[PDB]
């Protein structure tokens, strides 16, 4: 149905169910409203793919309502780094525009290497590839270059609402991010 | 049936409540328990359509009881702004004059842009257009020039009561006022 | 039934039910266990039209218990003035005879403005107008001359008991004093 | 069945219950373990009518268990004064015996007014009259001479039990009484 | 059936159920764990109804367990006096023989008066008479002469285990002591 | 189904359970979770008699667990002594033998007198002697020397669960201790 | 039904718990988020049974989760010590692959003895010997060489999880390890 903007504050997890999902110890997390953009990417295709719950994604006048949270290990440690955005749309179709949004303008972006400019000063150099997409679905991966860290990352467009989960560390999120959308999607 | 005159301090929604709909921390919130007008419009038509909860339309001799609530994000902070008002009426004849005294004096403010002189000092300027509007319900948003804010608001006469919902916001709130107007309605059963 | 005199105690709603009936704050009770008038009006007719539990109406050597209450928005605030009055009679003829002593000695009180010289020293001017009346019922409306204040009172006559009910406000009380006329009744 | 001694902790009702009985405030009881008399009347046949839980009723070799309490409106208030008295008895014959002490010995005082001698100095005039008497019920009024306070009395016989209620108060205590008296039967 | 070692802490009922019984205060009790004899009588067939819990009768090889408590109406008030006393021995036929130490060592006390020297130095004189007494029951009361006071004792035999009951006050503590015996004997 | 090693904790009872088991107070516990012993015999066939949870009988390469609690009176009293041990076996067999190391080393102890030195530097003189003993059961019962005073002992082979119950008290702990093996044995 | 990553923070008992499957006082435990080897061994092949939750074992590109846990019956008390690892994979032949790192790795440690190095500086001699072993389940023990005190190990493969379960204690620790280990697998029917 269309899904009530209440569900965003309901649809984000909190650090605790986080922790319960990823098997780990999530202590910090800090919830953000308003999309977000803090960086900008070399090869610009990949833009909608370096993170969730982006200004160029999500605003839109028929955008209902959003709410997001990105949850860490602590403070200071990023063994785990997990991110969710949920947006609530007016109608079907301004989500499913929002949407391809992501998959449109992400062509050319699968098997290519690029730097990534923090706001806070900082550069990153992340290996973007693959991902399995539907028409409702679309996920991706992309590992940071000269580590065995990987953030595995969906999209899922359910009618009026577009769900984004990421989960960052060592080894496989793969199970971890599909757990994780599907516990939010429940929520609906 | 006609509703009690003690659903309106059951039908206006706590900050709590009103932040589950709109979806947004909402840590701010005023009962007022008397119809109350804080300002004045340029175009004098736009007049019951610029707030709700007006004296013009809710102050009448059958009036039985009124309450209402301005809720916010915080005391400072206006992200989203939600209001409330829900007057019960000795007969339906008198709720129903009470509605129309916001459908009749409203008529040629749809499309039309005024300013709006707010008790405190500030001004601000709305673009104003009439939305969907049957014989017991009447919904209409408003957005402020310059800006992607926009408030949706509806007035429902429900018998012998004529609730009013405004929600604002940047995006969308048409979907937030319907959720808060339903869950302020389901309360007159009772 | 013929009611017990401990309906009395039960039958008198409190300020917090008050205000749920008449849908606004009520802060402010003060119970009076005894019958009393603390004022005396110009025209005597309309006596027992000015105010409820009046020794003229209730003392009798077959009053069984008396209660009742006088509720207010604040101690320094009368937007809402309730009150009520409850009396249980030995026999259904001493209740009756009670009852008749409102209606008889109230003809010609009708249409009429007034003086009621209150015991505090203050001095105010109500326009009283009969209401509909059965064998069991009388009700009356008082307006204060020079305001929208109106008084809606409700005087039953049940089986051994007589209940009386009074809501000030601006507006229309009419409603709100036949819900607690009613809920003070359920008690019996 | 012939009820147990402990029954009489139970038959007396504390002041909570007697207030809802009566219809009124009572703050003020005081419980008596043994029968005693604070008083002697000038005209001795209406000696057992004047007060309740009196030596002369209820002292008997076969007395099993007595329980009593004084309640009023507040130590200084005597709006409102109820007492009650509750002796078990080894036999039924004990308890018959005991209740035709009541009845027997207050013939020719039914009519009669006398004065009342108290035990701190004071002396009261009251007028007696008789009420409806069974075999197993004694009911009477006593009248205190130049006031419209009186006193309705029932002594109840139930098996082996001896009941006896007293409510006193300005209008009609004889639904009170009758209620009170019902409420500590139940108990046994 | 025989009654476990555990009953006896279970079997002796607390100073608030024993003023249920009696139907009257009991503010002061002491428990005994121990089979005590705190006097000494002139008559010697009267030892064994003088009290009860007396090693005389309890102290035995086969004793498993016994517990007792002596309950007043206060520290300082003797208006009821209860006790209570319960042995569980290893075989029915030691309880037996507890049993018949009450019964054939006071025969020639009934229907007599003797003096008994407690241990604080004082004296009383106690006139004793035997009650109805079946192969499993011994019920005896005595009086102290000069005052209307009475003592009824109930002695139970019930397989393994050894009851004793007294009840002392002015009046018929005779219904008292059979519904404590009773109670106790629930417990089992 | 052979008891799992975790029975141990609740296979022993608190000071509380033991007290409605012996019918007393018992207000000082100790629990041992590693089998002592704190004496050494004369007679030194009676040494697996004198005491329960002894390192002799349950040591084994094949014990699993075990937990015990010495009961008391109070810390200066011994009224009542009660002392539990329960071992759990890795296998059947290995209980069986632990079982055989009480019945076999204490061939010849029956009714003979001992002295036992306790570390703390006392000594009593104990006269053992044997009970009823099945395949699965070993029962016995020592009696401190000029004393009425007397220990009864119960050992258990239940599966893979070596079961120890001891209860020292004047008269006949023979019930008590009974119920205490019974009591301990339905936790299994 | 491939066990969810999450299944490891339930599946890794908590003092309480593991204090009445070993029936002892169980006062002191520390949470381990990340496989580690805190120890070298002399024997290299007895490397894998020396303890549970051994990089060596569990870090693969496939590794989703990992949690353990050690537990004693104080901070200063060792009567008791339990150890806990669960890890969960990918897929199950990445579990599977981790399983055989333990079983291929280990051939010809069973009847040896040789000494283990601690982080800490201290040594400790461990005689090892290889218990019932199935497709889906590795038991060994080993004791301590001069005393009584023996750990019996149990390591399962459940789909995509690999368990772990330690027991050290004088007398037979065969059964509470085989309770633990099953009190673990319950908690894999969790979503």
């Given at each position: 149905?269309?899904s009530?903007?209440?569900?965003v504050?309901?649809?984000?997890?909190?650090?605790?169910?986080?922790?319960?999902?990823?098997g780990a110890?999530?202590?910090?997390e800090?919830?953000?409203?308003?999309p977000?953009?803090?960086?900008?990417?070399?090869?610009?295709?990949?833009?909608?793919?370096?993170?969730?719950?982006?200004?160029?994604?999500?605003?839109?006048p028929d955008?209902?309502?959003?709410?997001?949270?990105?949850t860490q290990?602590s403070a200071?440690?990023?063994?785990h780094?997990?991110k969710?955005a949920?947006?609530?749309?007016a109608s079907?179709?301004?989500?499913?525009?929002?949407?391809h949004?992501?998959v449109?303008?992400?062509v050319?972006?699968?098997?290519?290497?690029?730097?990534?400019?923090?706001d806070?000063?900082?550069?990153q150099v992340?290996?973007?590839?693959?991902?399995p997409?539907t028409?409702?679905?679309?996920?991706?991966?992309?590992?940071?270059?000269?580590?065995?860290?990987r953030?595995?990352?969906?999209?899922r467009?359910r009618?009026n609402?577009?769900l984004?989960?990421?989960?960052?560390?060592?080894?496989?999120?793969?199970?971890?991010?599909?757990?994780?959308?599907?516990?939010?999607?429940?929520?609906?």
């Open positions: 149905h269309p009530e903007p209440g569900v504050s309901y649809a984000v997890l909190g650090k605790g169910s986080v922790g319960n999902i990823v110890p999530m202590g910090w800090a919830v953000f409203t308003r977000f953009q803090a960086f900008w990417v070399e090869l610009p295709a990949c833009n909608n793919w370096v993170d969730i719950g982006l200004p160029e994604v999500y605003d839109d955008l209902a309502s959003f709410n997001g949270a990105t290990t200071t440690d990023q063994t780094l997990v969710q949920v947006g609530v749309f079907n179709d301004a989500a499913d525009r929002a949407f949004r992501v449109d303008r992400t050319g972006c699968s098997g290519q290497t690029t730097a990534i400019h923090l806070d000063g900082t550069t992340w290996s973007f590839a693959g991902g997409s028409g409702t679905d679309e996920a991706w991966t992309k590992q940071e270059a000269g580590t065995d860290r953030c595995f990352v969906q999209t467009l009618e609402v577009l984004q989960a990421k989960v960052c560390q060592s080894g496989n999120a793969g199970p971890a991010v599909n757990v994780l959308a599907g516990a939010m999607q429940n929520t609906l």
